[PDB]
């Protein structure tokens, strides 16, 4: 057992998209820089089965390659579909099958015991690539059922550092096996002064810089030093004189929790879409959906409707936003004033038949078709409100048959001249223009209340993790932190300051009755003072007076800083640290904490 350095060795391509001069900062599996990785010295059996946490970054500097194959598998007990790579002399074959590997990882087919029910096999003919000892590096992982293997075999210099070469590298995607079997253990195959360089691709946030040619120029690990943390906050790779803060980069999220829904049985959402003759125009039904789970996928491909004009909320991403109650209406109007169904519109049916408030976070839907109705007999079944002496209030039933009066004198209920009835029949003929087509419109009203959610999206539900820095998106409130099972009963509802600039502290579990306190993983206003990478590569930290003891330090009324020394002398203010005190960069060449020249 031994440790060594793995600087700038382990960076690969996250996806297969060939971009050009972009900024990629996706939190994927990478090997951090300056990580204490194991260095196996081989001339015998010294390397045991290596743990496959999230990926293996193998490397070897040697000539006349005798270490070429790698042994994969979950338990290596002929239980699951293992992986084998046979590239002895000229026939390279990647077989995804159950091989019982014995205690002899070297060659020549005596490595495995026998065969079993095998699976797909890659027939890749390209070979897996007395002057010096060339370097060959490979990256193995498996995510989303894709066993991706990366390789950047390149001629190395003739033993300049003798441990690991300098410069940045990016292993191009070699192959991608479509098998989705899980792998937990890792080993190697000897094809018989080499060296085994392996590491663990622990999940962290990495930043890369692509070019127009395809190569990656720079890359930052965002987890090595406070300067590295600050570099991944401005979305850049060069820094200058200044002081900047970070946001939860020293501790990276491990897993992801959602737990959005709690119900599996759907609701009768199609009864209002496909049924018999609906309501009239003067009267409109209102079905109140209850505890259920929403599945808008069946409303898209089946029964192709018209445009999904959704006002207030986004027209897409409707399978994630969860509400408390969702009401379903019913209506059928003429195909000449349907545009008045939008919020804030005016007209005939939007003034005396059905009004909409100025704030309506719902959506309209229509499946206008004169085939289910409008027979050739004379259509006078549907009625509508004719006129009203007063204005209609939004979301108000109008079940009333009072004698409408529009003359200079009241009619006293006679139905004569200027005393017409306020309900006039409609006429829907199948042979007419587009302006006389029955639009069976429905205004699905989506509102949010203070009650627990009853019908959420169709996504799945993950497991709850306690005492861990993770992300959680329960009811649209995405939060990165640690959840604690506390006893803070009487869930807060802080809205005094209207939530202008304020975050949350605790939430309620949407699955069962529970309280989860949200705590930041690592914060406190950690501001790093970077003088610039052009001068040196040494920075200091400062805290805005939180604890002065994080669970060459000087005490001031601004917090505590580490990485400098206080100077009793005073000079010109160059870099303001805090509370008037400033710093500079003078000769050894470093930063000081001289007093402000007041």
């Amino acid at each position: 057992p031994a440790y060594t350095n793995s600087f700038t060795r382990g960076v690969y391509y996250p996806d297969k998209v060939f971009r050009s001069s972009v900024l990629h900062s996706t939190q994927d599996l990478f090997l951090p820089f300056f990580s204490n990785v194991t260095w196996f010295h081989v001339i015998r059996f010294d390397n045991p089965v290596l743990p496959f946490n999230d990926g293996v970054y193998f490397a070897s500097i040697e000539k006349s390659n005798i270490i070429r194959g790698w042994i994969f598998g979950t338990t290596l007990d002929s239980k699951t579909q293992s992986l084998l790579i046979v590239n002895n002399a000229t026939n390279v074959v990647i077989k995804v099958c159950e091989f019982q590997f014995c205690n002899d990882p070297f060659l020549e087919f005596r490595v495995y015991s026998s065969a079993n029910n095998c699976t797909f096999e890659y027939v890749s003919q390209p070979f897996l690539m007395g002057n010096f000892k060339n370097l060959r590096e490979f990256v193995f992982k498996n995510i989303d059922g894709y066993f991706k293997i990366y390789s950047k075999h390149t001629p190395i210099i003739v033993r300049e550092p003798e441990d690991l070469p300098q410069g940045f590298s990016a292993l191009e995607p070699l192959v991608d096996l479509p098998i989705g079997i899980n792998i937990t253990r890792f080993q190697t195959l000897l094809a018989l002064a080499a060296a085994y360089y392996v590491g663990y691709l622990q999940p962290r946030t990495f930043l890369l810089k692509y070019n127009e040619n395809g190569t990656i120029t720079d890359a930052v690990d965002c987890a090595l030093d406070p300067l590295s943390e600050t570099k991944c906050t401005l979305k850049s790779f060069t820094v200058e004189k200044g002081i900047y803060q970070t946001s939860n980069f020293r501790v990276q999220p491990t897993e992801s929790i959602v737990r959005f829904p709690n119900i599996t049985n759907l609701c009768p959402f199609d009864e209002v879409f496909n049924a018999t003759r609906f309501a009239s125009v003067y009267a409109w039904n209102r079905k109140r959906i209850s505890n259920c789970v929403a599945d808008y996928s069946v409303l898209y491909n089946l029964a192709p409707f018209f445009t999904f004009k959704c006002y207030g909320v986004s027209p897409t991403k409707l399978n994630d936003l969860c509400f408390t109650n969702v009401y379903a209406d019913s209506f059928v109007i003429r195909g000449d004033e349907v545009r008045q169904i939008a919020p804030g519109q005016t007209g005939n049916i939007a003034d005396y038949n059905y009004k909409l408030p100025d704030d309506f976070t719902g959506c309209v839907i229509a499946w206008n078709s004169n085939k289910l109705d409008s027979k050739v007999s004379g259509n006078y079944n549907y009625l509508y409100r004719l006129f009203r002496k007063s204005n209609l209030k939004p979301f108000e039933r109008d079940i009333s048959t009072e004698i409408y009066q529009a003359g200079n004198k009241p009619c006293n209920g006679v139905a004569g001249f200027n005393c017409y009835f306020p309900l006039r029949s409609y006429s829907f003929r199948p042979t007419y223009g587009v302006g006389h087509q029955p639009y069976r419109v429905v205004v699905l009203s989506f509102e949010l209340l203070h009650a627990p959610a009853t019908v959420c999206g169709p996504k799945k539900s993950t497991n709850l993790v306690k005492n861990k820095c993770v992300n959680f998106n329960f009811n649209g409130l995405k939060g990165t932190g640690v959840l604690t099972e506390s006893n803070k009963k009487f869930l807060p509802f802080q809205q005094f300051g209207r939530d202008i600039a304020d975050t949350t502290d605790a939430v309620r579990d949407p699955q069962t009755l529970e309280i989860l306190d949200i705590t930041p993983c690592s914060f406190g206003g950690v501001s790093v003072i970077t003088p610039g990478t052009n001068t040196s590569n040494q920075v200091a930290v400062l805290y805005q007076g939180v604890n002065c003891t994080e669970v060459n330090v000087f005490q001031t009324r601004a917090g505590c800083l580490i990485g400098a020394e206080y100077v009793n002398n005073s000079y010109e203010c160059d870099i303001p640290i805090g509370a008037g005190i400033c710093a500079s960069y003078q000769t050894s060449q470093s930063i000081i904490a001289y007093t402000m020249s007041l």
Partner: nanobody
Amino acid sequence: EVQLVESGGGLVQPGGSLRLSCAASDSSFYDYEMSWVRQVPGKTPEWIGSMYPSGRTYINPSLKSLVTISRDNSENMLYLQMNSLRAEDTAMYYCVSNWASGSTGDYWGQGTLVTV
């Protein structure tokens, strides 16, 4: 438990007054607007008349000035006297408590098929 009854039908001669009888289930189901709708075989029904709770009635402009209906006694009286009968309107007739809540709050009648 709405169990309204409908009576009146059978053989009829073209030209006359068809006397129907739509009686409620001895309850207060007359607080809202009831309807009389005609259904022909092998096709969707066709609305005929609508009686509002405020002593008013409304028929379709197609079949206009040929059918009258009134209560005038505060009882279950929905005769719907159709004047100038013929053989074209011979179809299925049944009164509904409210023809404005399709498949949600409506209760159709049993059914009284007539012949000509």
